[PDB]
Amino acid sequence: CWPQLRLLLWKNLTFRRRQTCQLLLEVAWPLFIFLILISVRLSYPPYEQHECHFPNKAMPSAGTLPWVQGIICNANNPCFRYPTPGEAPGVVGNFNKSIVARLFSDARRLLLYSQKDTSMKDMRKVLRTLQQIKKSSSNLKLQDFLVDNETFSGFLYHNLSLPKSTVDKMLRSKSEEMIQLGDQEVSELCGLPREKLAAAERVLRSNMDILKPILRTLNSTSPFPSKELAEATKTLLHSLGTLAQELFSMRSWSDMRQEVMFLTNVNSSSSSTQIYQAVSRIVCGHPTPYCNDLMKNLESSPLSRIIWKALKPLLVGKILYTPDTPATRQVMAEVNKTFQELAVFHDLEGMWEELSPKIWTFMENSQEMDLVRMLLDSRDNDHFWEQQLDGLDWTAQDIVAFLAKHPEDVQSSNGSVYTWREAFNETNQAIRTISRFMECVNLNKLEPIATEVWLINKSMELLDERKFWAGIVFTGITPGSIELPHHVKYKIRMDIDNVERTNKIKDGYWDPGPRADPFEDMRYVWGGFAYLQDVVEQAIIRVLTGTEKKTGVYMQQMPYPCYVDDIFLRVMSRSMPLFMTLAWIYSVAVIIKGIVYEKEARLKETMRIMGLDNSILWFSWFISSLIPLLVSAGLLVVILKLGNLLPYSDPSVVFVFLSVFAVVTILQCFLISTLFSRANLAAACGGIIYFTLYLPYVLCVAWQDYVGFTLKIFASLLSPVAFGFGCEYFALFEEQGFNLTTSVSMMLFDTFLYGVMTWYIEAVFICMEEEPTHLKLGVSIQNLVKVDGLALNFYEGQITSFLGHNGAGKTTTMSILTGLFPPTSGTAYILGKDIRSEMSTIRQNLGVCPQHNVLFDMLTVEEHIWFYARLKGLSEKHVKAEMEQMALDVGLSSKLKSKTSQLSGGMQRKLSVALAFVGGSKVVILDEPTAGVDPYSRRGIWELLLKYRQGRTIILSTHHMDEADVLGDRIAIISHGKLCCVGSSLFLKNQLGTGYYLTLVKKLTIDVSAISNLIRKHVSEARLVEDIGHELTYVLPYEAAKEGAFVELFHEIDDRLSDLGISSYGISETTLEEIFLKVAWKLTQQQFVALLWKRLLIARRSRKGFFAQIVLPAVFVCIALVFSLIVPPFGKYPSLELQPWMYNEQYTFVSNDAPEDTGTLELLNALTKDPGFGTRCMEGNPIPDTPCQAGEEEWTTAPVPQTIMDLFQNGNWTMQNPSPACQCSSDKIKKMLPVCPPGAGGLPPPQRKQNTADILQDLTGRNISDYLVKTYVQIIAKSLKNKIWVNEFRYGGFSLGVSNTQALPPSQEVNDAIKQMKKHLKLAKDSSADRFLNSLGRFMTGLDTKNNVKVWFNNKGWHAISSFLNVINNAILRANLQKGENPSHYGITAFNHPLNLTKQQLSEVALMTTSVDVLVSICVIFAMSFVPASFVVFLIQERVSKAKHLQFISGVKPVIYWLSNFVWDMCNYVVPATLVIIIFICFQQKSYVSSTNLPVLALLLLLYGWSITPLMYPASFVFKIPSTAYVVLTSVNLFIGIINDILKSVFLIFPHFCLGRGLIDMVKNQAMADALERFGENRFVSPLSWDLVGRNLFAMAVEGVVFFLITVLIQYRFFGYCPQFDAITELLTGREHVEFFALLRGVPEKEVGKVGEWAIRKLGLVKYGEKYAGNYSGGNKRKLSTAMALIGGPPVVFLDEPTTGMDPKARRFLWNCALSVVKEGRSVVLTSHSMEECEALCTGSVQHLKNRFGDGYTIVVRIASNPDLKPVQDFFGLAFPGSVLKEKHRNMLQYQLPSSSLARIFSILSQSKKRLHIEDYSVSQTTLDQVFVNF
Ligand SMILES: *[C@@H]1O[C@H](CO)[C@@H](O[C@@H]2O[C@H](CO)[C@@H](O[C@@H]3O[C@H](CO[C@H]4O[C@H](CO)[C@@H](O)[C@H](O)[C@@H]4O)[C@@H](O)[C@H](O[C@H]4O[C@H](CO)[C@@H](O)[C@H](O)[C@@H]4O)[C@@H]3O)[C@H](O)[C@H]2NC(C)=O)[C@H](O)[C@H]1NC(C)=O
Ligand SMILES: *[C@@H]1O[C@H](CO)[C@@H](O[C@@H]2O[C@H](CO)[C@@H](O)[C@H](O)[C@H]2NC(C)=O)[C@H](O)[C@H]1NC(C)=O
Ligand SMILES: *[C@@H]1O[C@H](CO)[C@@H](O)[C@H](O)[C@H]1NC(C)=O
Ligand SMILES: *[C@@H]1O[C@H](CO)[C@@H](O)[C@H](O)[C@H]1NC(C)=O
Ligand SMILES: *[C@@H]1O[C@H](CO)[C@@H](O)[C@H](O)[C@H]1NC(C)=O
């Protein structure tokens, strides 16, 4: 069986090897598509992010400064890549390195020190004691004061204009110089040098006075003289020493000024990142017109956009409020207390202004400052004070301190400048700048509003002012004195731009990454919502309970474990089949086209005839079409593995999966192919069928409702879902490198089911001659039983013809001869071999040739003949020799390699019948060969048949008469399934033949009675059988031939041929055909309405016809409506959300860090009592919540695996501080989405307790940062391997704790210190000192944290932050209440509900809605441009030799025909138009009761035909292919349908008709939407639905198609009957056909039927009148076509080939009707191929044509044997030298005598009849075919 399959695959591949265009594109398309895919992939490189930790935020509950820093420091969430110390369980503040906090702590230290410092009082009492004992110590540079008992040189000396010394008589040029020198040298130790210098130029007389100053000792030795003041001086030294140590131990103000100087001091001062680095180091560690000007500059400042967006609303925004209930007035009080806690800086400018002169004069002129300066520099101070300062801290120096302590002027500037004066400049400048900046903040942001409508109006009014902060709206009952209803409910209404969208609560589809973009997702921490939430909760708790703050709250994001952004890979691997199988769509279309093409010309059936079963053909198609699929899959695997697209999977498994999918899809192709019967129809519809087969996978990918065995239910029945599921498994296991085995099994089962379905569809869709025993019997059929009984025998070399009526068999008989259907209880001896006993050996030697030619197109003759010889089953040399021998004599040695498609039809038939004889088949059966063949080639095919008749048993079953007679030597006639007669032609004629016929011809002018009487005189048996123009025919019986008068009458007619008016004569033998029959204007309007009456019938009768013209658009608009009713409006941002967990399944965790049970224990208890984890209060408030408080109150640990020893040895080499496990971080070349924990990071299962829809994990002392990162992956990987499409595991928890108490004593001491300070140091009760001191006290009080909780919120959940903040604040309030009856009653809820959108936002959402409705528009335009496809395809249907030309012969005025067609097109278009108007008029989309929708949509839809249908007509003029425009027109309409350019598109689409329709519809829809949204809440504008913008342009563009219709009519104008092909509409009936043609003829309607019912009776067809035309046979169709010409009876008629392979006993009425038409008196014209029609109907005359152009007489004679043949030959050769033996066989021969004179031949044969024993003899003339063969 191998050679059969080999040759079968050979021809299968040669169908494609000879095309060179389909195979090339088939190979190129997948390569090009996947190269484009790879280019797209490489255009999007994967993004990799490290495992990054997030800095913790702060909130006003903690303190103003921490969250101010959080706003300014970390507004980007920079992903520190390592655990921030804030994320540690214990330490939270994260702000040691912040020097601003250091400055504030130093200020607090200074306040607490000055609370208990008495240095100033010591100075005052020292000065008082000095004044009341010494009374004179004002010893400045000029003069020295000393008024006492003169303990140490008590005297005075003044540096004045003259030398004055009150110790003696100074007596003074020299005096002034000495005084000036002393004043210049007035220093601690310069007095002695000045005295020495003076004494150098003076005498010792002034020396004695110089002796007095020596005891002065620069006012140092004097203090030692008084013992009472010594203790006070020592106390002063100690006090100033410790004060200086404290002042120099801050090291913060100096560091900040040093760091701020150099940025604006360099000459270049170029802008760079240095300023940002310095600012960050100041705020964190290493890792009116002026106000507008500064804000604009900050906005334009680089790297400041995010901080500006975070800050601007904070300090410029304003809030709103509710009816001013006194309790809510207290809420204002608390909130604006919290806000004014930051407002300390407003009064610092006033403090500077009020105390600058005082502090200036105090340290410049007061005696206390002078005493301090004097004590700061002394020998005793050098010994004691300097040593104390040096040992206290690393201060600058004692001399350095004395420099900037209390000077009088600038000493030197060139050397070094460091003085108190420059610092005082800089402090003044800094406070001026601070005041200028702080005058930009509107801290008066409390605006009560009573009504909600005015509330919202003022909200938009402030928003348009570019300043709007959040807005709080309570739900108070009445303005009553009762504070709160114990359950607080409010909505924080804030604008859209600053609050996250409230439409969706989750991310939607799962997406890797922490989702922590600083600007795009932090909208709850930079938009300020969460700050308002926390502040309002703190104020409410203060109102209801009384505790001051007792709580701080921090925000911390959930750390994320080193993801990777491979979104493209995931999204493509979720949908690889689409763009991978586009190429396979092309391939399956090609395969189905090939299969239906070979099914068209019935190649499969003929192949089955030659002895092959359908199974081998199916297997060959399988292999030959799988091989290209296999190579395509190999190329795909190569481009995937080497393309860096799907690594981590072996090429072998993907190749195997692709091969399996190819097998399944090829079996699906085989299934879907056998249901179709047209080539291009199948080729076009294969892609649509595959789309319909594939879409359910896309539908089911999202529903995920088919987890169970229903998945197998839709997998076995449907192929692409299983492959998509295997693709899903590949995507899941792609990174970490139901199951694939299940997918493979489902694919195999689906393939088997498809094969079974394909097999089922294929399976369900007297007269007897004496037989000479000398000649061998080749086919001896005896006892044939069929459900008919007959028997017949055939000879080895005898030609045989089989005749009948096509109804009594001859399709069962040849089928029995072949393998179509075995006989029932019968047998047939073929070459002595039984067909039932032998079913193999008989097939290879059985030739056959059916009606349809077997010719593989795109192939030459050599491959056809070689393939057939191979299929017959011979060797190589044998088939080569047979091929050469057949080619030598067939007549194909010229066209050795010519294309069979280029061969003529007659040559094609000759080649087919030649193929029927190749291989030396001993038996061959033909079946009406040479039907549509050239008459010239008839003789060539006859020559081939007579040459191949040497022992071959040729069988003919033809409907032709002449061929069966002249060729066939024995024929059989069968009646009603019974063999009526059989025998040779002459023998059968001998007893059942009609009388001999003789024909005479004329030149009207010849008497007929004269010749009739003359002939009747000689013989009385002559009878006239016919009388037609210029012709005459007489018949004489064979019985009593009367040879005497016979030859005599020939003698007179030869002698008197020219004597009478006759011209010549002829002989026509009794034709076998009759033997076979015997044995077995008002007219214009009438035509216009006639066309419409014609066309209404197609719609009225085609119930099962092309009804998809209505159903399909309706369904395709239904699907568009369903799609539009599901998509989100995009304008429903407002919503009414609560803030519970609001999540399906989750559980949090509580970490009681620092278990010192100070105040944290109470808060923890409040989280685990009867009130519960949420906001419930003895009732279920959240309607999703459904409390269902079921769960044990005792902690239960989850079961543990056998890894307890692993935990035991984790303590070794991994301490308590780290508890990690190694993680598989992505490599440089190797990567994955999870990170795999080899063991279990955070292995010990934390304690569990189920309370309410959650089981909180009581963590304690665990490394939470590591534990969360580990367990998150440890759970997500497990929940993703099964691919449940799982959401995030945990959405957030929180860790408690207590801040370190290393700071200064609590605010209870700071406030008392402030109170003690203010009453001292010139206490004032003004509006500046009191307010500033109170603000400073509040600022100090607002910087402590006795405890602080930290909310570990997961940012993936959009509303997690606010919800968890609300939960913890509820816990805080429940814990703070004292001696309450029950904490379950209380609780707080905080709705989020944004404002209404503004003008720009409303316009944007309207545009988005338009973008969404684009798809609805494209679907509608698809349906409305798809509807005219039916009209156009019917136009081509009637155009292809059916009605166009045929109506063109009839007077129809072609101008009005197209107008009538257009009128019908409009009249039919309304129904789909009305249905598509009604389809969405029941709903409330795109149309309403308003007059702004219906007039502009219904009219547009109705009149769209006016534009679409005229343009379709020119697309059908030159279109020589039927029923394929239905696809190409739809495709081109789709391709058409799918700021200068936008403005010019109005004129660009003005001449166009299709594209503008959808655009204008969208303009109308968007205009209506914009009008409704604007008029809902804004001013009124005139709707423009029917205005000149879109509607008038649409009307003009559509109405411009009248020109297109006129152009189509002009193109049509520019370019009896019966054509060769039948011209009948395939669904109407013949009765209505003749009615239509009669009505077009001109007969009035009152008598059209009487005419039609006449014409049908002229052609019979009583049983086929009012029936379906498509069920008619060829004979009935030809009969109807012939009647179509004779319906009106034109004076001249044209008829073409009346008989085309039609059954007998029916065509006789055809000749009768033709003769009736001829004899009625109307001239006719006829042309055909069969000369029988011409000689039977056509009347130079045929007899005259065959007389001179034709050959001579032809005689046949039979003698009873072989030896008797020689005497006949000798006698006829001697008597007649001119004779030709054309045919000769044993016992019968043919002679051709080219002599016109015939009388002597009859005389010779009659004279000596007895001697040579003549029994049967007859003479005839050459047929009309002979003369045309000669010509
Ligand atoms: C819970 O578990 C997690 C596990 O991830 C712990 O996280 C670790 O935290 C420590 C510090 O808290 C991290 O240590 C840091 O390592 C960085 C890089 O270390 C590599 O490079 C150094 C130098 O070449 C090598 O010696 C070392 O072996 C590594 O190869 C450094 O940037 C850090 O040092 C810098 O910062 C500190 C602090 O500012 C300075 O004092 C240093 O001088 C230096 O400038 C630091 O040492 C560690 O990488 C984190 N991961 C792991 C796996 O250990 C959490 O700490 C733990 N929870 C708690 C509360 O501790
Ligand atoms: C902002 O939007 C809300 C809700 O869409 C409007 O609230 C309306 O209030 C009035 C009177 O109660 C009623 O029309 C409805 O109850 C609410 N909805 C609508 C759609 O009207 C509110 O009027 C809007 N504010 C502005 C200024 O337009
Ligand atoms: C700051 O440093 C001190 C060490 O003196 C430490 O006790 C304290 O916890 C640190 N605070 C923060 C917030 O890191
Ligand atoms: C809020 O208004 C002003 C501005 O901050 C402030 O002085 C006042 O004290 C605050 N409100 C109350 C009720 O104290
Ligand atoms: C700034 O203060 C210094 C202090 O010595 C002084 O010299 C200078 O004049 C001051 N400048 C102004 C503009 O007041």
Short mmCIF file of C-alpha atoms in Angstrom, two decimals, residues 1062-1249:
data_model
loop_
_atom_site.label_atom_id
_atom_site.label_comp_id
_atom_site.label_asym_id
_atom_site.label_seq_id
_atom_site.Cartn_x
_atom_site.Cartn_y
_atom_site.Cartn_z
CA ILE A 1062 -36.55 19.12 -59.09
CA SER A 1063 -32.82 19.59 -58.57
CA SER A 1064 -31.52 16.46 -56.81
CA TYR A 1065 -32.40 13.76 -54.28
CA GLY A 1066 -30.94 11.92 -51.32
CA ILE A 1067 -31.15 8.88 -49.07
CA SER A 1068 -31.70 9.05 -45.31
CA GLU A 1069 -31.82 5.73 -43.48
CA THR A 1070 -34.19 5.23 -40.56
CA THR A 1071 -32.37 6.90 -37.68
CA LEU A 1072 -31.81 4.92 -34.49
CA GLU A 1073 -33.54 7.67 -32.45
CA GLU A 1074 -37.15 7.00 -33.49
CA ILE A 1075 -36.45 3.26 -33.24
CA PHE A 1076 -35.33 3.89 -29.65
CA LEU A 1077 -38.48 5.90 -28.92
CA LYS A 1078 -40.75 3.24 -30.46
CA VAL A 1079 -39.10 0.23 -28.81
CA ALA A 1080 -38.89 1.87 -25.38
CA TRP A 1081 -45.91 55.33 -21.41
CA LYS A 1082 -48.06 52.54 -19.99
CA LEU A 1083 -45.60 49.88 -21.17
CA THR A 1084 -42.71 51.52 -19.31
CA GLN A 1085 -44.68 51.59 -16.04
CA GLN A 1086 -45.79 48.00 -16.63
CA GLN A 1087 -42.16 46.91 -17.01
CA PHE A 1088 -41.15 48.95 -13.95
CA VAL A 1089 -43.78 47.29 -11.76
CA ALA A 1090 -42.86 43.96 -13.38
CA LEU A 1091 -39.31 44.22 -12.03
CA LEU A 1092 -40.60 44.91 -8.51
CA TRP A 1093 -43.08 42.02 -8.78
CA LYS A 1094 -40.15 39.84 -9.83
CA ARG A 1095 -38.00 40.93 -6.93
CA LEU A 1096 -40.58 40.82 -4.11
CA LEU A 1097 -40.75 37.06 -4.72
CA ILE A 1098 -37.16 36.39 -3.62
CA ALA A 1099 -37.93 37.92 -0.22
CA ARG A 1100 -41.41 36.38 0.02
CA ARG A 1101 -40.39 32.79 -0.85
CA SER A 1102 -36.87 32.44 0.58
CA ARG A 1103 -37.88 31.48 4.12
CA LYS A 1104 -34.84 29.19 4.25
CA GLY A 1105 -32.90 31.44 1.85
CA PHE A 1106 -30.59 34.37 2.55
CA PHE A 1107 -32.42 35.44 5.69
CA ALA A 1108 -29.11 36.39 7.35
CA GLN A 1109 -29.50 39.85 5.79
CA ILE A 1110 -31.88 40.60 8.68
CA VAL A 1111 -30.83 38.33 11.56
CA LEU A 1112 -27.10 39.10 11.53
CA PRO A 1113 -27.23 42.94 11.92
CA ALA A 1114 -29.75 42.61 14.74
CA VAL A 1115 -27.55 40.18 16.68
CA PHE A 1116 -24.41 42.20 15.99
CA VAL A 1117 -26.14 45.28 17.41
CA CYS A 1118 -27.45 43.28 20.37
CA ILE A 1119 -23.88 42.29 21.24
CA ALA A 1120 -22.76 45.92 20.94
CA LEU A 1121 -25.55 47.01 23.29
CA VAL A 1122 -24.62 44.28 25.78
CA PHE A 1123 -21.00 45.43 25.65
CA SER A 1124 -22.01 49.08 26.13
CA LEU A 1125 -24.21 48.22 29.14
CA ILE A 1126 -21.27 46.61 30.99
CA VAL A 1127 -18.40 49.11 30.54
CA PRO A 1128 -18.04 51.62 33.41
CA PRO A 1129 -19.46 55.11 32.81
CA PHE A 1130 -16.10 56.71 33.79
CA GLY A 1131 -18.13 59.57 35.32
CA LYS A 1132 -19.27 57.92 38.58
CA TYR A 1133 -16.31 59.04 40.71
CA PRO A 1134 -18.71 60.09 43.52
CA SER A 1135 -19.68 57.24 45.81
CA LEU A 1136 -20.82 56.52 49.36
CA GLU A 1137 -18.10 54.35 50.90
CA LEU A 1138 -17.66 53.45 54.53
CA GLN A 1139 -14.15 52.62 55.80
CA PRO A 1140 -14.22 49.07 57.17
CA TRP A 1141 -11.88 46.38 55.90
CA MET A 1142 -14.49 46.18 53.06
CA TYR A 1143 -12.51 43.23 51.71
CA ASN A 1144 -13.58 39.66 51.03
CA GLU A 1145 -10.99 37.71 53.03
CA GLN A 1146 -7.94 38.98 54.91
CA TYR A 1147 -6.42 39.20 58.36
CA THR A 1148 -4.25 41.76 60.12
CA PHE A 1149 -1.61 41.48 62.85
CA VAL A 1150 -1.03 43.21 66.19
CA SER A 1151 2.51 43.61 67.56
CA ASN A 1152 2.60 44.75 71.20
CA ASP A 1153 6.17 46.01 70.97
CA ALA A 1154 7.86 47.11 74.20
CA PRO A 1155 5.58 45.16 76.61
CA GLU A 1156 6.06 47.52 79.55
CA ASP A 1157 2.27 47.71 80.20
CA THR A 1158 2.40 51.49 80.66
CA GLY A 1159 -0.46 52.59 78.41
CA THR A 1160 -0.08 50.20 75.50
CA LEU A 1161 -1.84 47.38 77.36
CA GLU A 1162 -5.11 49.32 77.50
CA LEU A 1163 -5.02 50.06 73.77
CA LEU A 1164 -4.29 46.40 73.00
CA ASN A 1165 -7.19 45.34 75.22
CA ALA A 1166 -9.49 47.75 73.37
CA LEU A 1167 -8.59 45.86 70.17
CA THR A 1168 -9.61 42.41 71.48
CA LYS A 1169 -12.87 42.83 73.41
CA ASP A 1170 -16.60 42.64 72.73
CA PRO A 1171 -16.72 45.84 70.58
CA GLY A 1172 -14.30 44.11 68.23
CA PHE A 1173 -11.81 45.10 65.58
CA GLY A 1174 -14.06 47.45 63.62
CA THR A 1175 -16.71 50.17 63.82
CA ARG A 1176 -19.76 48.12 64.84
CA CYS A 1177 -22.08 49.19 67.66
CA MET A 1178 -24.69 46.59 68.75
CA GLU A 1179 -25.89 46.55 65.12
CA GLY A 1180 -24.63 45.79 61.65
CA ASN A 1181 -24.00 49.18 60.05
CA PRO A 1182 -22.00 48.07 56.96
CA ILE A 1183 -24.44 46.19 54.76
CA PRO A 1184 -21.57 44.08 53.30
CA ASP A 1185 -20.23 43.33 56.79
CA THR A 1186 -22.86 40.86 58.08
CA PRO A 1187 -21.34 40.76 61.60
CA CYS A 1188 -21.57 36.98 62.26
CA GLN A 1189 -19.46 37.25 65.42
CA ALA A 1190 -18.38 33.60 65.55
CA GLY A 1191 -14.90 32.60 66.66
CA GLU A 1192 -12.95 31.31 69.64
CA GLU A 1193 -11.51 33.83 72.09
CA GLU A 1194 -8.45 31.67 72.91
CA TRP A 1195 -5.26 31.85 70.88
CA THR A 1196 -4.64 28.74 68.77
CA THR A 1197 -1.39 28.11 66.93
CA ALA A 1198 -1.58 26.68 63.42
CA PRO A 1199 -0.22 23.14 62.94
CA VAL A 1200 3.52 23.07 62.33
CA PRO A 1201 5.59 20.87 59.98
CA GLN A 1202 8.55 18.74 61.10
CA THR A 1203 11.02 21.64 61.14
CA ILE A 1204 11.11 22.38 64.88
CA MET A 1205 14.79 21.41 64.92
CA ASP A 1206 15.36 23.89 62.10
CA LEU A 1207 13.93 26.63 64.32
CA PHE A 1208 16.00 25.30 67.23
CA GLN A 1209 19.22 25.68 65.23
CA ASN A 1210 18.21 29.05 63.77
CA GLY A 1211 19.26 30.39 67.17
CA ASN A 1212 22.79 29.33 66.23
CA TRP A 1213 24.56 31.93 64.02
CA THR A 1214 21.31 33.92 63.59
CA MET A 1215 20.45 35.90 66.71
CA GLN A 1216 17.12 37.40 67.76
CA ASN A 1217 17.84 40.57 65.78
CA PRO A 1218 17.99 38.86 62.34
CA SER A 1219 15.71 35.90 61.53
CA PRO A 1220 16.19 35.63 57.75
CA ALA A 1221 16.46 32.92 55.13
CA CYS A 1222 18.46 33.16 51.93
CA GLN A 1223 16.42 34.34 48.96
CA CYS A 1224 16.73 33.67 45.23
CA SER A 1225 17.20 37.21 43.99
CA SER A 1226 17.19 37.67 40.23
CA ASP A 1227 20.51 37.19 38.44
CA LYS A 1228 21.92 39.47 35.73
CA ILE A 1229 20.75 37.07 33.00
CA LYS A 1230 18.24 34.91 34.93
CA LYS A 1231 15.13 36.36 36.55
CA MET A 1232 11.69 35.55 37.95
CA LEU A 1233 8.67 37.34 39.38
CA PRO A 1234 8.49 35.76 42.89
CA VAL A 1235 11.48 35.15 45.12
CA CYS A 1236 11.64 31.54 46.24
CA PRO A 1237 12.20 30.81 49.95
CA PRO A 1238 14.04 27.47 50.11
CA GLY A 1239 12.82 26.88 53.66
CA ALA A 1240 10.39 29.20 55.42
CA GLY A 1241 11.28 32.81 56.19
CA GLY A 1242 9.58 33.64 59.46
CA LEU A 1243 8.90 29.94 59.79
CA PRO A 1244 7.09 29.68 63.18
CA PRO A 1245 3.36 30.14 62.54
CA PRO A 1246 2.30 33.13 64.65
CA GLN A 1247 -0.60 32.81 67.06
CA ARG A 1248 -4.09 33.07 65.58
CA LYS A 1249 -7.50 34.25 66.75
#
